[PDB]
Design a protein around this ligand. Structure first.
Ligand SMILES: [Mg+2]
Lengths: 130, 67, 55, 98, 104
RNA sequence: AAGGGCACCACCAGGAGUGGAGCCUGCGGCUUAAUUUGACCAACACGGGAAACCUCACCCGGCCCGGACACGGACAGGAUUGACAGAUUGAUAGCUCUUUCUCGAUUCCGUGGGUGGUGGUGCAUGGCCGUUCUUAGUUGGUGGAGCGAUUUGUCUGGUUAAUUCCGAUAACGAACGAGACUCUGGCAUGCUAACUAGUUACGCGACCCCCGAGCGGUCGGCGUCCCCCAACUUCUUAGAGGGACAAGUGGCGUUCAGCCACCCGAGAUUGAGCAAUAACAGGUCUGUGAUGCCCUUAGAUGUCCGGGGCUGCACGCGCGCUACACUGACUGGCUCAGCGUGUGCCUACCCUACGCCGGCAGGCGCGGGUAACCCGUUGAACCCCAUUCGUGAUGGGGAUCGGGGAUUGCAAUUAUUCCCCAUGAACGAGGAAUUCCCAGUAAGUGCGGGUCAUAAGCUUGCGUUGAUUAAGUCCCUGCCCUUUGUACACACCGCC
């Protein structure tokens, strides 16, 4: 109806929401092995799946970190209470996620490994992962 | 820079001593030497000022002059 | 200053009313389809939103 | 910051009701979208949050134009002693029904 | 009872849109619902043309971003009430549903 | 220097032009308190940069702290914060001054230390982007040659848009790029479907003919998914598919790779996107809560508010718009599109039918549309058909300039824009130079989107009308490969 926004604006808003959530999750969970986000939107309730490598680190003490993230997303995007749920999924064959290898190499460089050795280690690991 | 005006003065408060602006008589008679702001937000705790030509409420900002 | 003139200037329109939803920039905005996002920020998040280059 | 006691108390009690705080970066918003009944603006909200962050009671994350403060345990104790809450009530993020 | 239901399915990729049309039509046909033919509203092309450069220096090369929105819709017919007959949607992410009674 | 090949960012033959006039706009200069700044093929309608305020970074002034936190002072006998009145101010900034009220631990002062900055540095950087370069080029492994930098592979030749392929071969086997790929356009009376698309047919109508037709002619008039109360998908929409391969024929060619022509066919080269190794002290720190260092940080280079500037003009240049007219202008009639937008998280501002008022811009009521549903069957321009003009600076051109009326906005002056009546300036096809272009192309011609409270001479797209010349060359400008010479390697803008 007139209250509902047009199809074009609705799809652009969905894309904007995806991008904003992706940026927020990237900034918050970069050191936790975050790789990407997928959302299957249903009118009854929405679910947000976080693709991560260190999913046990993503899920805090008794799920405290995921509870905080869910509450933050709920407040920021104005979802009705209880209508948004966040789950975490471990990425299979993490060596093939080009994003995850980027933070791995960043971790090595921040630790202080020589750049040639770190890059060669990451390259060898990627090829070993296949 | 060399701005033509001198550095603007900043107001410092007078740092007045105890308020005590209401007196009792003959070993205690409740009496005000000031004025009361009659608004419902000023209340009875506050007191109007005693300027030379008007009275001013601290909260209600009401002014009563004599003409 | 105090409450009377700090934000007293009307900002109902013009470039001062509109800023990028990402970088808080006032130039190169894209208000088509209600994006409200900077020229370069759109190039950054186009594939994330769902905008692709077909031709 | 010159915020009054009531505004500070409301800001802290929202963090204790739930251990998160989302705030749009806008010092010219007349009211925070939540707790608008107390009539305190986003400027005071974000300044109280930066005081908490500098004192180590909250973790600050900043996406595009929003802050996403997460309450810590060091902040749990501080809010407990500041709000005089008994050592039995915890935020929903800290404990959900369990 | 008698009710009329129109289901509008709108998405960005024709593969998922066609799959979510086909399975709905198949289920309704199996339940012998009278299915009005799958009609295809003309596709919407959201086109944005910006400058590739971020600084305005260069040979003025323009970037052309497209967004294709595809819209199909179905009409369900039965002498019996239809919501109790079909309650699930059996969709996949990327598509949006819109159920509407003919009163509106 | 030679040999071979290639390109409308080269030429040829041509078209339209630009350079000449006016004007819009962007650079330099001059002026200025400031006229913010970057950039000099690959800068100059570029920074999506159409700036009244904001923007804003510049200039003249004035406020605020939005200086976390730690420590030390001060303090409920008061740390400190606001304030009506008068003076003051551009200001109804309690900014400051007189006056006292008022809040109460939130602050204030000092020392460290934050934080912010469209502040410096793009010659510190990331990312992005442009360019070398859209040319066809680039690289390992093992083997061969060389003491080695290196070389072969990566080639005599033919062919190709292409180190594309055929072949020769101390190379063999590969990898990238090219190609392949994705989107778009052209064809499917074949399939699937369609009240948010229609076409036929039928029934009601309305008008003409009526001599006499009558299954006559027109209807964007109403109906037959207002569910029993028609069918169909040609037109429209969009999916699955098919379809074109140098496949068939003739000739040329080692008869190889391929080339030319022809038939059938909608189509025998449709346009784009993407795009290698290596690099540039190319551009951006004025896109970013990308960023190192440096500067500033309370009389601020933070931020806010008021005003001005970014437009300012002896002049030079670039992109364009309008023209110089009769293949035209004016007046009227008739007649045809396709892209695509449309009511706002913040955020206030949508597209508009219809009726009335006004000459116009507009105004006033009623709707419809979050959209194949309403604007809208987008009654567009050019073009077409009639009228007047008559080779003149003329009814060409509309610059400049006066007066009046509206609309947007808080505000229109240095005219925001629009309307009306007056003024009709240069300009009679433009030197040297120089740009772009090969088929639905150039060009004429309008319409959308972006910017947008107000807006296009810009740009990005769309349609409409629609050609001349050419199917070549290395002459100029360059590019690729081979050989060659070199005292160059910051690589000929070299060196000396
Ligand atoms: Mg005339």
């Amino acid at each position: 109806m007139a209250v509902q926004i047009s199809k074009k604006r609705k799809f652009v808003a969905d894309g904007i929401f995806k991008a904003e959530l992706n940026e927020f999750l990237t900034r918050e969970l970069a050191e936790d092995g975050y790789s990407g986000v997928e959302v299957r939107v249903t009118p009854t309730r929405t679910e947000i799946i976080i693709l991560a490598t260190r999913t046990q680190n993503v899920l805090g003490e008794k799920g405290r970190r995921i509870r905080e993230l869910t509450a933050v997303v709920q407040k920021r995007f104005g979802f009705p209470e209880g209508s948004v749920e966040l789950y975490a999924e471990k990425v299979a064959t993490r060596g093939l996620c080009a994003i995850a290898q980027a933070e791995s190499l960043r971790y090595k460089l921040l630790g202080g490994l020589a750049v040639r050795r770190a890059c060669y280690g990451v390259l060898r690991f990627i090829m070993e992962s296949g | 820079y060399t701005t033509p005006k001198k550095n603007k003065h900043k107001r410092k408060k007078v740092k007045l001593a105890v308020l005590k602006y209401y007196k009792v008589d003959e070993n205690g008679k409740i009496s005000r030497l000031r004025r009361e702001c009659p608004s419902d937000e000023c209340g009875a705790g506050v007191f109007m000022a005693s300027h030379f030509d008007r009275h001013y409420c601290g909260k209600c900002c009401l002014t009563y002059c004599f003409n | 200053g105090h409450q009377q003139l700090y934000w007293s200037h009307p900002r109902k329109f013009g470039q001062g009313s509109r800023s990028c939803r990402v970088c808080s920039n006032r130039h190169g905005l894209i208000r088509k389809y209600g994006l409200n996002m900077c020229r370069q920020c759109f190039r950054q998040y186009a594939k994330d939103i769902g905008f692709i280059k077909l031709d | 910051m010159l915020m009054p006691k009531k505004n500070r108390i409301a800001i802290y009690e929202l963090l204790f009701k739930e251990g998160v705080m989302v705030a749009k970066k806008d010092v010219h918003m007349p009211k925070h979208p939540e707790l608008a009944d107390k009539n305190v603006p986003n400027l005071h909200v974000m300044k109280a949050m930066q005081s908490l962050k500098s004192r180590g009671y909250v973790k600050e994350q900043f996406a595009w134009r929003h802050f996403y403060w997460y309450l810590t345990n060091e902040g749990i104790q501080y809010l407990r002693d500041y709000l005089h809450l008994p050592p039995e009530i915890v935020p929903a993020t800290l404990r959900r029904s369990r | 009872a008698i009710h009329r239901i129109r289901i509008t399915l709108t998405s960005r990729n024709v593969k998922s849109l066609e799959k979510v049309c086909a399975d709905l039509i198949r289920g309704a046909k199996e339940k012998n619902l009278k299915v009005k033919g799958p009609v295809r509203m003309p596709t919407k092309t959201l086109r944005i043309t910006t400058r590739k450069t971020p600084c305005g220096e260069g040979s003025k090369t323009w970037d052309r971003f497209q967004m294709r929105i595809h819209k199909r819709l179905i009409d369900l017919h039965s002498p019996s009430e239809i919501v109790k007959q079909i309650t699930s949607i059996s969709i996949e992410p990327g598509v949006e549903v819109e159920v509407t009674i003919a009163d509106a």
